[PDB]
Amino acid sequence: NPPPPETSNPNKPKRQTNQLQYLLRVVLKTLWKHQFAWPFQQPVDAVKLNLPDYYKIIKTPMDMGTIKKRLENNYYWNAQECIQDFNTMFTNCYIYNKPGDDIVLMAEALEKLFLQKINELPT
Ligand SMILES: COc1ccc2c3c1Oc1ccc(O)cc1C=C3N(C)C2=O
């Protein structure tokens, strides 16, 4: 396993915004309870899950546990930075797998719920 993505960085510029607050309270915490969220709540453990090729293929890993920690730690500058992490998470799943896989069906459903939730954000 590589080290997991950072969740703090003292030199990184950070901000507290209504949209980032909403991404934690509403978007992340709603996705988290979905029946399909569980593969995405923690970094992929390639040793535990017996996927020795995972980090051979996925070079920018991302997961909702990391995102949740980043939001709780005030890691982001703006909502777009957070949204990019979700997009990276979903794309990683499509890249490492293929159409029709169970994990991909899960990511597809979550991504559609995610887009529904960020379609309108607070001002
Ligand atoms: C062979 O099972 C797979 C195959 C691919 C993927 C996953 C798989 O299973 C998991 C099992 C437990 C868990 O903690 C996370 C996952 C998340 C996965 N992601 C994100 C994948 O792309």
Curated annotation (Swiss-Prot):
Which organism is this entry from?
Answer: Homo sapiens (Human)
State whether it acts alone or in a complex, and with which partners, per the record: Interacts with p53/TP53; the interaction is direct. Interacts (via CTD region) with CDK9 and CCNT1, acting as an associated component of P-TEFb complex. Interacts with RELA (when acetylated at 'Lys-310'). Interacts (via NET domain) with NSD3, CHD4, BICRA and ATAD5. The interaction with BICRA bridges BRD4 to the GBAF complex. Interacts (via NET domain) with JMJD6 (via JmjC and N-terminal domains); the interaction is stronger in presence of ssRNA and recruits JMJD6 on distal enhancers. Interacts with NSD3. Interacts with NIPBL. (Microbial infection) Interacts with bovine papillomavirus type 1 regulatory protein E2. This interactions may serve for the tethering of viral genomes to host mitotic chromosomes allowing successful partitioning of the viral genome during cell division.
Which post-translational modifications are recorded for this protein? Answer: Phosphorylation by CK2 disrupt the intramolecular binding between the bromo domain 2 and the NPS region and promotes binding between the NPS and the BID regions, leading to activate the protein and promote binding to acetylated histones. In absence of phosphorylation, BRD4 does not localize to p53/TP53 target gene promoters, phosphorylation promoting recruitment to p53/TP53 target promoters.
Q: Which family does it belong to?
A: Belongs to the BET family.
Q: Which organs or tissues contain this protein?
A: Ubiquitously expressed.
Q: Site described as Acetylated histone binding, positions?
A: 97
- The part of the entire sequence present here spans 44 to 166 of 1362
Name of the protein described by the UniProt record: Bromodomain-containing protein 4
Q: Which portions of this protein are annotated as coiled-coil regions?
A: none
Q: What is known of its domains?
A: The NET domain mediates interaction with a number of chromatin proteins involved in transcription regulation (NSD3, JMJD6, CHD4, GLTSCR1 and ATAD5). The C-terminal (CTD) region mediates interaction and recruitment of CDK9 and CCNT1 subunits of the P-TEFb complex. It is also required for maintenance of higher-order chromatin structure.
The residue ranges of the Bromo domain are 15-121
